[PDB]
């Protein structure tokens with residue numbers, strides 16, 4: 001299964017260089033984009049955390065959390081643990097750690113993985129008034145041996161292009177790294193313009 005992705009990352013992400021490192025972001029962001037396209041997500045945040053980890057926050061419906069009969073597992077777990085808008089499990093496999101929070105029906109559902117492997121069963125950790133999905137991942141330096149350092153300008157350029165191609169979407173990019181903190185927010189107007 002996912003062990004194949006860890007051993008042949010080149011076949012899954014094209015490159016283990018800086019290009020592959022950035023590709024991980026789009027593999028998550030694309031799913032938030034799909035949920036905006038579905039009509040439910042209005043805003044997406046992409047955050048470069050102070051340790052070069054990545055958080056992606058949307059206000060869509062939230063990844064389905066129900067047990068599926070075919071697997072016996074919550075749908076969200078399968079998303080991240082089974083090889084398949086299908087790259088979520090690839091990002092998981094190539095990260096030292098990934099955590100997902102699903103905000104749905106007044107509850108926050110949480111699960112974490114370590115180099116692709118489940119830590120514990122999906123758990124309600126909190127109550128909430130919001131809806132959406134937050135994915136945070138730390139790219140694996142065993143995989144990304146050239147660089148694990150993100151390029152804010154490169155991410156921002158694409159985020160801007162995505163805002164344009166998905167006219168109406170609010171999407172931001174934030175850098176929380178030491179001595180270079182920055183945030184750019186993009187929104188191209190629809191018929192209200």
Ligand SMILES: CCc1[nH]c2nc(Sc3cncnc3)nc(N3C[C@@H]4[C@@H](N)[C@@H]4C3)c2c1Cl
Pocket residue numbers: 028029031032035056057058060061062063064079085086088133134135
């Ligand atoms: C934060 C990134 C994100 N946001 C999402 N919102 C949603 S909301 C949703 C709710 N109900 C049905 N489909 C999507 N789903 C997701 N997935 C479900 C399945 C897509 N092929 C993978 C990832 C994601 C993902 Cl991954």
